[PDB]
């Protein structure tokens, strides 16, 4: 992992919520780069998201 | 008619007590008694059980725990040798959850509840102390998985998921990397489920990470209190103890009272055939035993010397009594009694870890998100 | 000189087995196996225990291969118990010693010759999908392995582009009393032309006796059953409906002139390869009594190598749960004259039937198009 820079429509919106709700944040990027879906894991009875 | 009932114990005094109990039950049909000691191995036990079954041709077998502390591998051969002919066997002082499966153990019932059933007391304590954030810590065994599944079902009954469940393999001597993860969470209530020999390593590691001071609440079971765990145990640990389970004799008297009520209803049916005395001769399945154990588990007993005797559809006990203990100044004191379905504390005062006297909230809200 | 025993039960060609035993040539490795044929009856499990004790104690027997001809299912459990109590590995080859096992012990060394439940389910699904049978239903009873079957079927039918149709899943209990009315009432809800089953022999006979009273077994209903439902092709309960499809293990052209030889070759090579590299061989005191301290030497390497063996251009590697992992399956059918006619074979996930179209045994028309 390497540090980068983030800005846009969803970045300045988190700052407004952080000032109104008075909390601290630490933004990072998703590893695999997907949104999320439920699949099957190693053909088992259980299912998980990604 | 005459029908004898057999059992297997390892004590001369227990044999005399069983003889006195069957003689007293004779005054309540004709029945006899049959007992045999324990062998230092398994195949000897199996051959002795077969020989005693051939010599007496009993219709029911009772078995308790040996003087061994584990009491797990001992009742294993008797179960197979008996259930080969599908005859009911009642357990007296067994606590493992392996005999709770109807597949591997078909004909087996319990008089005391197993270790996997001390999860409703914790649920009632959480409901009465409004605790909603807990940290489960079980071991990588069958008992741990059974208790974890029971607690997860009890929690999901109200649609409330646990925060995080952590596991550790048995025989571990360094769980520092595991406890370092449970300290970065929101909850402050730690539920532990391990063995007396393994719990001593968790207590010795928690005392180094300052996880046993104020604001923390420790909830454990019965096996985590006794043994060598009291040597390394911080104050405020709320343990559990069974009412009369530890003593053998109270049950033997109560066991012969409920099984005899089924024999009166056993001989009152048609197509009745006594089990064969051919432990060596036959290999067939006796017609009795599927209908015998059907009404045996449903035999509602009125009242005995150790409380009411009931049975669920799993071959286990029901409506047990637990004493909510508490450790203060290296001395356990009784604080409450679990009345089967509710918790009622007495006038004694409760002490919490750290030294303060106040019910912790068991939650520490953080102001840093990801 | 490794002592390998051979045990047979019931009527069998003892002279043919004795003649075919001297057919393996393992002179390329230092094995020099000793063979001791012994025959016995089917008196009782305790007789088997005494027999295996005497054989282990007679002369340095380090391995036993078991064969039988009866349809008893608890023989496998008894052999698993013996192989758990003793560190001598035993193998299941034929008869009751081949029937399926729920779960072995953690330290048990017992391997059977036969397919698992998932393999049979996959074979039946291939049979169904080859003849365009996309609508079916599942009915089974309480048995140690029904849940794996249902889970395997559901997992297979959820990730395919073809159109499956599953409905009316039943879990009826035949162990209850006076429930035949409820069984016959639920059973009338079936409407699919394909019905799967997972039971025992007597359970299947009773289920068919109840089903033929309703009448969904005459013309437009096909029944598929696993290998344990038939068991012995020589005997027929005369109540099985005509046209019963069953997948069984290969036993016609593969009797017992070579199974014992293959088992002896496996154990022998295993003992050789465990001796060559590790420069050691587990040869403790060959006794069955006082074996609580006989586990002083770790034998998990031999257990870890017994699941990897190849000889005479064949793959005999076992699996984690202890099945052949590569069997040769056949397909039989019950025709008018009550017998079993082989229809097709299955090997290496490759099904090869003999009929291009299934013979229907009027509202069945033909249609031509362009």
């Amino acid at each position: 992992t390497v540090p980068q820079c983030c800005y846009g429509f969803c970045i300045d919106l988190l700052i407004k919520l952080a000032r109104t709700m008075q909390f601290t944040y630490e933004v990072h990027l998703v590893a695999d780069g997907k949104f999320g879906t439920q699949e099957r894991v190693q053909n088992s009875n259980k299912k998980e998201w990604n | 008619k005459i029908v004898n009932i057999g059992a297997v114990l390892s004590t001369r005094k227990h044999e005399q007590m069983f003889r006195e109990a069957v003689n007293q039950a004779n005054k309540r049909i004709q029945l006899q008694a049959t007992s045999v000691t324990h062998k230092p191995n398994a195949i000897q036990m199996a051959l002795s059980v077969c020989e005693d079954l051939i010599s007496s041709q009993v219709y029911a077998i009772l078995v308790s725990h040996p003087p061994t502390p584990n009491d797990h591998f001992t009742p294993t051969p008797v179960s197979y040798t008996a259930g080969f002919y599908r005859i009911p066997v009642l357990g007296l002082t067994t606590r493992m959850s392996i005999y709770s499966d109807k597949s591997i153990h078909l004909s087996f019932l319990r008089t005391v509840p197993p270790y996997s059933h001390q999860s409703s007391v914790w649920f009632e304590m959480m409901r009465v102390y409004n605790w909603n954030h807990i940290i489960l810590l079980v071991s990588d065994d069958h008992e741990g998985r059974a208790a974890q599944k029971r607690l997860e079902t009890l929690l999901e009954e109200r649609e409330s998921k646990a925060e995080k469940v952590l596991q550790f393999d048995p025989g571990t001597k360094n769980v520092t990397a595991l406890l370092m993860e449970a300290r970065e969470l929101e909850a402050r209530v730690i539920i532990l489920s391990a063995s007396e020999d393994d719990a001593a390593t968790v207590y010795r590691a928690a005392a180094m990470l300052d996880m046993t001071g104020s604001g923390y609440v420790w909830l454990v079971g019965e096996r985590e209190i006794s043994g060598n765990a009291l040597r390394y145990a911080p104050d405020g640990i709320i343990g559990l103890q069974l009412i009369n389970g530890k003593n053998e004799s109270a049950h033997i008297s109560d066991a012969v009272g409920v099984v005899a009520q089924a024999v009166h209803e056993l001989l009152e049916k048609e197509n009745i055939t006594d089990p064969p005395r051919g432990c060596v001769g036959n290999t067939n399945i006796w017609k009795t035993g599927p209908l015998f154990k059907r009404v045996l588990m449903s035999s509602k007993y009125a009242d005995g010397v150790t409380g009411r005797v009931e049975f669920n559809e799993d071959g286990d006990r029901k409506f047990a009594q637990y004493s909510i203990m508490n450790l203060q100044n290296r001395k356990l004191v009784q604080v409450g009694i679990y009345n089967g379905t509710h918790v009622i504390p007495n006038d004694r005062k409760i002490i919490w870890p750290g030294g303060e006297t106040e019910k912790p909230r068991g939650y520490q809200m953080s102001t840093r998100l990801k | 000189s490794i002592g390998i025993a051979v045990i047979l039960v019931g009527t069998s060609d003892e002279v043919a087995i004795k003649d075919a035993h001297e057919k393996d040539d393992f002179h390329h490795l230092s094995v020099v196996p000793r063979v001791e044929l012994v025959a016995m009856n089917e008196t009782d499990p305790k007789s088997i225990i005494t027999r295996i004790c005497d054989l282990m104690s007679d002369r340095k027997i380090q391995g036993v291969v078991f064969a039988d001809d009866t349809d008893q299912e608890a023989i496998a459990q008894i052999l698993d118990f013996i192989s758990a109590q003793t560190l001598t590995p035993i193998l299941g080859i034929h008869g009751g010693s081949s029937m399926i096992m729920a779960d072995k012990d953690e330290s048990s060394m017992f391997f059977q010759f036969g397919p698992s439940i998932e393999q049979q389910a996959s074979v039946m699904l291939n049979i169904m999908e080859e003849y365009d049978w996309y609508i079916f239903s599942i009915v089974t009873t309480y048995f140690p392995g029904y849940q794996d079957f249902v889970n395997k079927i559901r997992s297979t039918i959820e990730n395919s582009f073809v159109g499956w149709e599953l409905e009316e899943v039943l879990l009826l209990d035949m162990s209850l009393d006076d429930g035949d009315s409820k069984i016959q009432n639920q059973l009338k809800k079936l409407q699919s032309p394909i019905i799967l089953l997972y039971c025992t022999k007597e359970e299947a006979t009773y289920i068919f006796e109840v089903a033929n009273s309703v009448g969904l077994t005459g013309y437009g209903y096909t029944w598929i059953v696993p290998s344990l439902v038939a068991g012995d092709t020589d005997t027929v309960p005369s109540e099985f409906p005509t046209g019963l499809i069953s997948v069984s293990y290969d036993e016609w052209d593969y009797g017992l002139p070579a199974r014992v030889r293959d088992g002896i070759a496996i154990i022998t090579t295993a003992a050789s390869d465990m001796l060559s590299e590790h420069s050691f061989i587990p040869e403790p005191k060959s006794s069955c009594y006082n074996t609580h301290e006989k586990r002083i030497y770790q034998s998990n390497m031999l257990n870890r190598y017994l699941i990897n063996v190849t000889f005479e251009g064949r793959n005999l590697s076992f699996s984690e749960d202890g099945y052949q992992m590569h069997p040769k399956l056949v397909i039989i059918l019950l025709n008018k004259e009550r017998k079993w006619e082989r229809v097709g074979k299955w090997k290496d996930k490759s099904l090869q039937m003999k009929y291009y179209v299934w013979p229907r045994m009027d509202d069945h028309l033909s249609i031509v198009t362009l």
Side-chain angles (χ1 to χ4, degrees), chain A residues 1-25 27-41 44 47-50, chain B residues 2-11 18 21-23 25-26 29 31 33-38 40 42-53 55-56 58 60-64 66-67 69 74-85 87-101 103-126 128-148 151-155 158 160-172 174-195 199-203 205-222 224-230 232-242 244-245 249-253 255-260 262-263 266-267 271-276 278-281 283-284 288-290 292 295-296 298-299 301-302 304-307 309 311 315 318-330 332-346 348 350-355 357 360-370, chain C residues 1-7 9-12 15-17 20 29-33 35 37-39 44-45 47-50 52-55 57-58 61-71 74-76 78-164 166 169-172 175 179-181 183 185-187 190 192-201 204-231 233 235-250 252-260 262-272 275-276 279 281-284 286-288 290-291 296 299-300 302-303 305-310 313 316-319 322-335 337-340 342-344 346 349-353 355-359 363-370:
Chain A
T1 59
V2 289
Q4 289 179 303
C5 301
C6 278
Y7 62 96
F9 185 86
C10 296
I11 302 302
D12 53 1
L13 181 61
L14 182 62
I15 305 179
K16 182 61 178 299
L17 299 180
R19 178 168 56 257
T20 302
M21 309 176 67
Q22 297 181 174
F23 66 93
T24 59
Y25 54 91
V27 59
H28 64 275
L29 269 64
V30 64
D32 60 329
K34 298 299 181 301
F35 283 91
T37 185
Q38 193 175 9
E39 303 284 352
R40 192 62 64 94
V41 42
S44 299
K47 302 178 63 180
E48 64 178 1
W49 301 83
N50 50 17
Chain B
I2 168 180
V3 42
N4 57 331
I5 304 299
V8 41
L9 301 313
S10 178
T11 298
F18 192 22
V22 67
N23 288 134
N26 285 130
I29 56 180
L31 62 154
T34 298
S35 180
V36 64
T37 60
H38 293 189
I43 48 179
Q44 284 79 359
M45 277 295 301
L47 61 88
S48 64
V49 164
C50 208
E51 293 183 49
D52 298 324
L53 180 62
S55 61
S56 297
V58 303
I61 297 179
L62 310 181
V63 56
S64 70
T74 301
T76 30
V78 182
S79 179
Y80 296 154
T81 54
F84 190 90
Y85 291 153
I87 51 181
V89 177
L90 311 184
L92 298 181
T93 41
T94 172
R95 301 300 298 268
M96 297 300 180
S97 302
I98 305 179
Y99 310 94
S100 180
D101 299 359
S103 300
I104 174 64
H105 298 83
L106 195 149
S107 60
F108 196 91
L109 290 79
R110 300 173 175 269
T111 59
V112 296
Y115 285 157
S116 61
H117 277 55
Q118 52 179 1
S119 298
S120 298
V121 182
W122 300 342
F123 187 84
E124 289 296 82
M125 290 180 61
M126 291 174 53
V128 75
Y129 291 158
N130 60 268
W131 288 342
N132 302 330
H133 304 77
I134 58 179
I135 298 181
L136 185 59
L137 182 59
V138 298
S139 60
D140 190 7
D141 287 319
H142 185 274
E143 189 69 42
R145 292 194 306 267
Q148 178 185 353
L151 184 59
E152 286 178 351
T153 51
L154 290 180
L155 289 181
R158 299 186 305 180
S160 179
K161 185 187 301 300
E163 182 165 343
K164 180 176 296 300
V165 179
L166 296 81
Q167 299 180 0
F168 61 96
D169 51 350
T172 309
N174 184 21
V175 292
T176 304
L178 191 65
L179 295 182
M180 284 294 300
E181 184 181 2
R183 202 180 64 178
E184 299 287 344
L185 299 181
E186 308 289 337
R188 289 296 181 267
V189 180
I190 300 179
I191 299 180
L192 183 60
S193 179
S195 60
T201 60
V202 182
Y203 297 150
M208 188 181 301
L209 278 67
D210 298 0
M211 298 180 60
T212 58
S214 300
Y216 285 88
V217 176
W218 292 84
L219 299 179
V220 298
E222 178 174 31
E224 294 80 357
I225 294 298
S226 61
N228 59 330
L230 292 181
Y232 299 151
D235 302 330
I237 295 182
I238 301 181
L240 291 176
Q241 288 289 346
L242 195 51
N244 312 321
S249 284
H251 297 278
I252 298 179
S253 60
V256 303
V258 56
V259 66
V263 180
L266 178 61
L267 281 73
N271 300 330
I272 172 180
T273 301
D274 301 70
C279 132
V280 190
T283 45
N284 296 119
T288 174
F292 193 17
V295 74
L296 197 152
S298 180
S299 60
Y301 193 66
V305 300
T306 177
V309 180
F311 300 95
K318 185 216 299 187
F319 297 112
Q321 309 297 331
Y322 302 93
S323 61
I324 299 182
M325 307 299 297
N326 196 331
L327 177 61
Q328 48 178 24
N329 201 334
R330 306 297 180 88
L332 279 74
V333 292
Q334 177 178 330
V335 187
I337 291 296
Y338 179 73
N339 298 328
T341 55
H342 287 72
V343 176
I344 299 297
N346 66 87
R348 197 58 181 269
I350 309 181
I351 180 179
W352 302 100
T357 306
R361 304 188 300 102
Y363 186 80
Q364 186 68 21
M365 191 178 187
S366 60
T367 59
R368 187 175 182 90
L369 309 179
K370 303 178 183 178
Chain C
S1 181
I2 289 87
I4 300 178
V6 176
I7 302 180
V9 176
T11 60
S12 60
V15 288
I17 300 180
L29 294 175
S30 302
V31 276
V32 58
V35 192
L37 265 62
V38 57
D44 55 313
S47 59
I48 304 179
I49 298 181
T50 53
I52 189 61
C53 266
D54 296 330
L55 264 298
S57 60
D58 275 359
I61 291 192
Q62 317 296 334
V64 178
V65 287
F66 196 89
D68 202 330
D69 61 331
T70 180
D71 298 359
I75 301 183
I78 298 157
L79 264 59
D80 191 11
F81 189 76
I82 266 65
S83 60
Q85 254 79 35
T86 58
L87 279 308
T88 59
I90 57 179
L91 304 180
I93 300 180
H94 182 268
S97 181
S98 60
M99 291 279 181
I100 101 168
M101 212 41 214
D103 282 317
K104 268 77 130 202
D105 195 4
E106 303 293 336
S107 60
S108 179
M109 272 167 155
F110 175 70
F111 296 156
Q112 297 176 347
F113 277 127
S116 61
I117 303 99
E118 304 175 353
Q119 306 181 191
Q120 297 176 174
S122 301
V123 168
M124 295 184 310
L125 289 180
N126 296 330
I127 294 172
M128 290 174 51
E129 73 179 3
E130 186 173 349
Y131 290 94
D132 300 330
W133 296 342
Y134 302 149
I135 300 179
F136 67 101
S137 298
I138 301 181
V139 3
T140 179
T141 56
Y142 290 86
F143 200 75
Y146 75 100
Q147 57 175 9
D148 301 69
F149 176 80
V150 179
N151 292 17
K152 180 27 128 100
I153 294 297
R154 292 183 177 182
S155 180
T156 310
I157 65 178
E158 278 291 339
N159 49 17
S160 60
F161 286 159
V162 300
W164 293 106
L166 177 137
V169 179
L170 295 187
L171 198 59
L172 59 94
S175 302
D180 57 330
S181 180
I183 296 306
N185 197 324
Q186 210 166 189
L187 188 60
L190 270 55
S192 60
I194 302 299
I195 304 299
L196 300 179
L197 190 62
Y198 180 81
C199 298
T200 61
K201 194 168 188 176
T205 57
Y206 180 80
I207 288 182
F208 291 153
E209 183 268 353
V210 176
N212 53 62
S213 299
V214 189
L216 59 159
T217 178
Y219 173 79
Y221 294 94
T222 307
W223 295 74
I224 312 179
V225 293
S227 181
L228 68 151
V229 177
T233 60
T235 172
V236 175
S238 67
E239 41 236 23
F240 290 162
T242 300
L244 178 61
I245 301 180
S246 180
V247 41
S248 180
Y249 191 81
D250 194 310
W252 291 23
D253 58 322
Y254 189 60
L256 209 68
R259 296 188 181 178
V260 183
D262 294 359
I264 292 178
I266 291 178
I267 289 191
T268 85
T269 153
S272 181
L275 190 148
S276 60
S279 69
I281 172 72
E283 42 182 9
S286 298
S287 59
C288 83
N290 293 18
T291 50
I296 179 61
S299 300
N300 291 20
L302 179 61
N303 179 269
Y305 192 80
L306 280 175
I307 58 180
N308 193 333
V309 50
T310 171
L316 285 313
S317 60
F318 291 90
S319 180
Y323 30 87
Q324 194 174 358
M325 197 61 178
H326 268 148
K328 179 173 56 180
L329 277 60
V330 297
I331 304 174
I332 50 184
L333 182 60
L334 198 66
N335 36 4
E337 300 178 2
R338 293 190 175 274
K339 286 187 302 299
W340 297 98
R342 177 164 51 185
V343 184
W346 182 90
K349 299 204 126 188
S350 181
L351 186 59
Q352 303 184 230
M353 300 301 245
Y355 299 153
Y356 191 84
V357 290
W358 189 258
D363 51 355
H364 186 65
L365 315 171
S366 181
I367 294 181
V368 69
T369 185
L370 190 139

